[model samples]
Target chain A: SLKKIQFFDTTLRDGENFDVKEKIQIALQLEKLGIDVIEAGFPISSPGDFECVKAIAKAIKHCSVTGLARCVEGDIDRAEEALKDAVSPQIHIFLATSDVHMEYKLKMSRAEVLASIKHHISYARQKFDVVQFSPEDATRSDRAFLIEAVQTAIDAGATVINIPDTVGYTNPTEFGQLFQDLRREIKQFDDIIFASHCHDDLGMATANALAAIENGARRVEGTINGIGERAGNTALEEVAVALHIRKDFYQAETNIVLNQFKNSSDLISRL
Target chain B: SLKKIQFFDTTLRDGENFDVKEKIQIALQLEKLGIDVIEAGFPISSPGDFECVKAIAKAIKHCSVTGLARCVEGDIDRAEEALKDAVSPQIHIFLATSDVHMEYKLKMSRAEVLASIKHHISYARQKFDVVQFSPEDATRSDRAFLIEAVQTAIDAGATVINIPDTVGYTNPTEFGQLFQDLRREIKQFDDIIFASHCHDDLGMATANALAAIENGARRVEGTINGIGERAGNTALEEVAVALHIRKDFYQAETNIVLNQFKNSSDLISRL
Candidate 1:
């Protein structure tokens, strides 16, 4: 069963199945589902996507709206451009932390990655009330490098530190234990939100995400219909249902209306 | 995604709310749905139940007919008496195996428990070609004791060793790992079918059952609408759908006809 936490509904940007209009519908629905942060879409991706984010900003009053960006100048600029009207705008920047991703994808050194995260998160925090930093493939990254990246981001004013199981390789037990270890090892851990973005390659994403909450993570990232890559990201429906079913086991609760799970699941499936 | 596994539908016995006529109708529908086994009911509960089991056995010919009983003299005797007329009769006998249950419920030592299992199993085997034994609370029981109990039942002529998550406390990792270990430790492990009777107390019975199959277990024990105890046992439909969806991850297959899942669930739920 899932433990309750702050739910980051990434149904639009990361969930690629739906178009811009469908994305707005899901964003509005996430507000109804009582999500904490509605990740509307990637602002720099397209004008249509930017418009959808703006629409979500205007329509949704109950939840914060966020735009995803790479740790690049143009991406962050575009992110701010799309979310100008949001009452609570968040800029989420991510960089590769694993050796394999850093070498093959980003082609950057450890120091370079840390500098980029610091610069981007610092700039994003100045404009928005919330700033989130993600270390891509954190599950596979070296402990020292991972800690350094997170510490740099937190110091630079990241309100949330998001750890991604980008490859979905870790089982629930190991994933939960790792997050628990991070809470103990990291400085100023309780001052910021500890978020998780889990993939479902090994069929354990939902279970692993729930485990992360049990291990002291304060936020969970998921897409409706689990529409991400391969087997997909965590299903919001499963996570919500899990929390409702096991309220007593975990010392936490969600803001989602329990009865709306079916409707949300149906709409997401159709999209 | 789930690989198809043999659908051992226990809609009648576990579906205790349904009347005799409704039970027969469900059995016919289960046959049409291509179930491999249709467990009728706990014949020892009452004379009416015995008649219901007998009627189901006579009416359903496409699938194997099974009767449930406790691993006691009267229960096994009543099960055999009720199932005598069935073309393919499998008598299932169960006993509590965990320390909590042993100390409080049965009040029998390990040696005494083993002797009782042997006596009932041998007697039932003499009368019926198929005899199934369930070690209730098998998931939380001591590994050495569980192995001993399973081995004793097998040696005493039980044809199927049903490992039940009677309390439904295990996660998939533990269930899969433990089933694999049991497969390796048991002497004549392959001679009899290894069955799983899981509950949804923790909401991972389907995944845990998949874990059991991935390890070595060949049969699954479930009821329609997942109706059994508090949170209910595994949903036959969920298991079927999971196996159908995740074919590559689970390399096993079932005889279920894939489509009648919702209809059967609704029918039994109404009853």
Candidate 2:
């Protein structure tokens, strides 16, 4: 039996260069390409973004549609409103959990961060059927605290937990080990889905995502052509083809339609 | 302690879009970027190709310059003539060894293939100090015969043995295992350098190269932006950055100047 991996595409949300109209078209194309989850946009980012998310939600019927938001009630509410018409609606909430992010960006103590995760995640769970929680800069966070934070999110009803190499600081070996360690530490690890979100700052996003899957991650979050912030995210096409070509080694399969990759890549590149 | 890897760049030879002058310019740029070996062009391919190879050979000083040839007398003679002006000249000869290639492409038997490897490699070795032999479609070749072919090349004084995933039919694990198995079977494995040349048809070139190094290969053959035949060769920038960023885990280092990657990539993209 082969393990099935989910592809969570963020070409609309993190791919920042696409306009609202382009996002809608890309989202529909992503659904056509069989993406498991289409992150439409950050609904709370702007009025135009919210409208685009809503449009994509209504247009895409095959895949689960999701919107990004901060771990705050207002952001969650905006995301909920935008995704109301989605066939399978989901909310993705992220919070900074690393020491540097906590001290400088969030300006919160460890305990305060824990309280925030419990508060926002539980609230978001009430509005969305699927809630995915990302601990921003998870690779840099203290391992013990990171595990604790994930446990808190799962307890608050997050259906998926995404571990991000937010700064692209982790390598494939280290990143894979993080997932293995988390599985041992987190409760009900097998019950909840684990996602790998990586940036290409050091040009190891594809490798890191493969490492994550080799360990315990079942969902791979990335964008087409790897277009995103900084060095960009993992190229979803690369990961998908790798799993397909090396299925005997990985023992994993994805729902991606391989024949449509070049067309999808050309579409993204033209924009 | 760190293991040092060698970068063998084939941008001018395999990056077929460039003109003669552009090839010369790119060859010089590659030298500045600290490439260990620069495969200038296939001297026997055309008169224009011979001129470009000769021009690059005269222009580049810091890197060893090489030209491609088949395991034939005329090809080796042309390669030798073209590389006469190079400060450090090398002859790279290749022959198809896989059963499918032998039967369809070369129309030769196994004994005939071995005879050719010994004949041409020895003839090339007499003319050039650096002789590299590539068993084309090595990953698909019978493992026992592949080992024998490499050993015959070594016996014929070939300085480097390159294992090519010619048709891009291999994944990282299987490709790496090929090198490992070769090391175990070959005599004086560390006496000569081992090289990896892969295509990106399945988008596993970089990962396959890394896996090769993790096993036994020390030299990586690639183009700057992965511009080559089919889906192109492994992207040198991707492999270089992977080694640099994951140095602690891989414990591998390369002499490539990290800052020149963007400029090199930009140059190739423009051409």
Q: What is the iRMS for every candidate structure?
A: 5.6, 3.1
Candidate 1: Cα lDDT at B189: 83
Deviation in Å, model 2, residue B268 alpha carbon:
3.3
lDDT of 1 by residue, B8-116 (tens): 7776766536777887888888888888888888888988998998899889877788888887778878887887778778888888778888889999989888888
Give the Cα error of residue B39 in candidate 1, in Å.
1.4
TM-score of 2: 0.89
Question: Which lDDT value does model 1 have at B259?
Answer: 76
Model 1 TM-score relative to the real fold: 0.67
Lowest-lDDT window of 10 residues in candidate 1 chain A? A242-251
Residues B1-271 of candidate 2 have per-residue lDDT tens digits of: 3778999998877764677778888888899899999998898999988888889988988889999999889999999999999999999999988999999999999999999999999999999999999999898899999998999999999989999998885765578789889889987798889999988886668777887888889899999988889888998898888787777767888899999988888888888
Ten-residue region with minimum lDDT total, candidate 2 chain A: A13-22
Cα displacement (Å) at residue B136, model 2: 1.4
Candidate 2 error regions (>4 Å): A15-19, A108-112, A169-171, A183-187, A245-251, A258-263, B109-112
Mind giving the per-residue lDDT tens digits that candidate 1 earns over A1-271?
3444788888777664677567778777778878888888787888877788788888878889998999888888888988888878888889989999999999999989999988888888787668899999999899778889999999999989999998876656567777877787787988879988988665556777777887888788988767777768987667767666656555577877767767777888787
TM-score of every candidate relative to the true structure: 0.67, 0.89
